[PDB]
Design an enzyme around this catalytic site. Structure first.
Site, PDB file in Angstrom:
ATOM      1  CG  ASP A   5      -1.982   0.832   1.348  1.00 20.94           C
ATOM      2  OD1 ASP A   5      -1.861   1.850   0.563  1.00 20.94           O
ATOM      3  OD2 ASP A   5      -2.928   0.704   2.196  1.00 20.94           O
ATOM      4  CB  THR A   6       2.258   3.309  -2.777  1.00 18.26           C
ATOM      5  OG1 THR A   6       1.069   3.486  -3.565  1.00 18.26           O
ATOM      6  CG2 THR A   6       3.042   2.165  -3.403  1.00 18.26           C
ATOM      7  N   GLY A   7      -0.060   4.187  -0.491  1.00 17.38           N
ATOM      8  CA  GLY A   7      -0.793   5.287   0.101  1.00 17.38           C
ATOM      9  C   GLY A   7      -0.880   5.225   1.627  1.00 17.38           C
TER      10      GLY A   7
HETATM   11  C1  LIG Z   1      -9.343   5.491  -0.799  1.00 21.16           C
HETATM   12  C2  LIG Z   1     -10.256   4.326  -0.524  1.00 21.16           C
HETATM   13  C3  LIG Z   1     -10.810   3.882  -1.899  1.00 21.16           C
HETATM   14  C4  LIG Z   1     -11.376   4.740   0.390  1.00 21.16           C
HETATM   15  N1  LIG Z   1      -9.515   3.198   0.002  1.00 21.16           N
HETATM   16  C5  LIG Z   1      -8.885   3.171   1.183  1.00 21.16           C
HETATM   17  O1  LIG Z   1      -8.806   4.064   2.022  1.00 21.16           O
HETATM   18  C6  LIG Z   1      -8.231   1.842   1.503  1.00 21.16           C
HETATM   19  C7  LIG Z   1      -9.110   1.157   2.537  1.00 21.16           C
HETATM   20  C8  LIG Z   1      -8.586  -0.260   2.804  1.00 21.16           C
HETATM   21  C9  LIG Z   1      -9.368  -1.000   3.878  1.00 21.16           C
HETATM   22  C10 LIG Z   1      -9.349  -0.272   5.214  1.00 21.16           C
HETATM   23  C11 LIG Z   1      -7.914  -0.352   5.673  1.00 21.16           C
HETATM   24  C12 LIG Z   1      -7.107   0.443   4.658  1.00 21.16           C
HETATM   25  C13 LIG Z   1      -7.132  -0.154   3.282  1.00 21.16           C
HETATM   26  C14 LIG Z   1      -6.309   0.670   2.362  1.00 21.16           C
HETATM   27  N2  LIG Z   1      -6.881   1.990   2.078  1.00 21.16           N
HETATM   28  C15 LIG Z   1      -6.054   2.657   1.146  1.00 21.16           C
HETATM   29  C16 LIG Z   1      -4.955   3.390   1.868  1.00 21.16           C
HETATM   30  O2  LIG Z   1      -3.806   3.491   1.049  1.00 21.16           O
HETATM   31  C17 LIG Z   1      -5.335   4.649   2.632  1.00 21.16           C
HETATM   32  C18 LIG Z   1      -5.582   5.778   1.610  1.00 21.16           C
HETATM   33  C19 LIG Z   1      -5.607   7.135   2.280  1.00 21.16           C
HETATM   34  C20 LIG Z   1      -4.458   7.855   2.304  1.00 21.16           C
HETATM   35  C21 LIG Z   1      -4.435   9.043   3.015  1.00 21.16           C
HETATM   36  C22 LIG Z   1      -5.609   9.561   3.552  1.00 21.16           C
HETATM   37  C23 LIG Z   1      -6.779   8.905   3.383  1.00 21.16           C
HETATM   38  C24 LIG Z   1      -6.802   7.657   2.757  1.00 21.16           C
HETATM   39  N3  LIG Z   1      -4.287   4.955   3.564  1.00 21.16           N
HETATM   40  C25 LIG Z   1      -4.574   5.069   4.907  1.00 21.16           C
HETATM   41  O3  LIG Z   1      -5.692   4.908   5.408  1.00 21.16           O
HETATM   42  C26 LIG Z   1      -3.382   5.423   5.775  1.00 21.16           C
HETATM   43  C27 LIG Z   1      -3.396   4.559   6.976  1.00 21.16           C
HETATM   44  C28 LIG Z   1      -2.272   4.963   7.851  1.00 21.16           C
HETATM   45  N4  LIG Z   1      -1.156   4.583   7.486  1.00 21.16           N
HETATM   46  O4  LIG Z   1      -2.226   5.589   8.910  1.00 21.16           O
HETATM   47  N5  LIG Z   1      -3.461   6.872   6.037  1.00 21.16           N
HETATM   48  C29 LIG Z   1      -2.428   7.715   5.773  1.00 21.16           C
HETATM   49  O5  LIG Z   1      -1.295   7.311   5.394  1.00 21.16           O
HETATM   50  C30 LIG Z   1      -2.682   9.144   5.995  1.00 21.16           C
HETATM   51  C31 LIG Z   1      -1.838  10.128   5.476  1.00 21.16           C
HETATM   52  C32 LIG Z   1      -2.088  11.468   5.740  1.00 21.16           C
HETATM   53  C33 LIG Z   1      -3.265  11.802   6.415  1.00 21.16           C
HETATM   54  C34 LIG Z   1      -3.512  13.149   6.748  1.00 21.16           C
HETATM   55  C35 LIG Z   1      -4.591  13.407   7.546  1.00 21.16           C
HETATM   56  C36 LIG Z   1      -5.420  12.426   8.041  1.00 21.16           C
HETATM   57  C37 LIG Z   1      -5.121  11.088   7.821  1.00 21.16           C
HETATM   58  C38 LIG Z   1      -4.084  10.799   6.938  1.00 21.16           C
HETATM   59  N6  LIG Z   1      -3.775   9.486   6.747  1.00 21.16           N
END
Ligand SMILES: CC(C)(C)NC(=O)[C@@H]1C[C@@H]2CCCC[C@@H]2CN1C[C@@H](O)[C@H](Cc1ccccc1)NC(=O)[C@H](CC(N)=O)NC(=O)c1ccc2ccccc2n1
Lengths: 99, 99
Positions: A25-27
């Site tokens: 998960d690069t995000g």
């Molecule tokens: C975008 C969407 C289509 C909704 N998909 C997803 O969100 C899926 C959901 C899946 C099941 C639940 C568990 C996570 C996985 C992976 N994620 C993808 C996933 O890549 C997700 C995308 C993302 C990035 C940043 C902010 C919001 C959303 N990353 C994350 O949720 C990670 C988790 C973490 N490491 O703490 N968040 C962050 O890295 C992150 C970065 C900056 C931010 C700034 C403010 C508030 C929150 C922030 N969170």
């Protein structure tokens, strides 16, 4: 290896003596693993993303094998529906995004 | 390009004729953009992330330029904290994960 993105990029990991499937998960800033009974000390943390925050346990210096590549770092344990390998460990296995 | 992961993989996108910064996210199935006025018909949808489910506006067949590469596909607009380019558009620009 090269992983295409037609499907979720799921790989086998080894953590705490157990094999699991996890999402490359690069995000994700962090590595978040589904609830499991890891030994040792931990620190409370809250992490966020879309939909808000969850409470997790932060474990440091945890060994994890990712698709055959060894890594060691911080792993967050809590109620996630998917094991997420984030950038803190993707960098250790020399992963890049290419296009 | 080849993008390493020591920093967030943020790129400039163009959507609705406007420049924005967005995260290239292999862990995201879908693309979610912060609230904005966007030309097109849309329909309400829900999507889920680490912290639960949110309401979004689903826009189909939207032109988006990602780091200079063209995609035309579905964009979800809603109160996401970060603009996320997910696999539905990463596949269109030929992105792969490599290690
Ligand atoms: C975008 C969407 C289509 C909704 N998909 C997803 O969100 C899926 C959901 C899946 C099941 C639940 C568990 C996570 C996985 C992976 N994620 C993808 C996933 O890549 C997700 C995308 C993302 C990035 C940043 C902010 C919001 C959303 N990353 C994350 O949720 C990670 C988790 C973490 N490491 O703490 N968040 C962050 O890295 C992150 C970065 C900056 C931010 C700034 C403010 C508030 C929150 C922030 N969170």
């Amino acid at each position: 290896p090269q992983i295409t993105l037609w499907k979720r990029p799921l790989v086998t990991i080894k953590i705490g003596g157990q094999l699991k499937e996890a999402l490359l998960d690069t995000g994700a800033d962090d590595t978040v693993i589904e609830e499991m009974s890891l030994p040792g000390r931990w620190k409370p943390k809250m992490i966020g993303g879309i939909g808000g925050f969850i409470k997790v346990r932060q474990y440091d210096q945890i060994i994890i094998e990712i698709a055959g590549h060894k890594a060691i770092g911080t792993v967050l344990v809590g109620p996630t529906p998917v094991n997420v390998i984030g950038r803190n460990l993707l960098t250790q296995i020399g992963a890049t995004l290419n296009f």
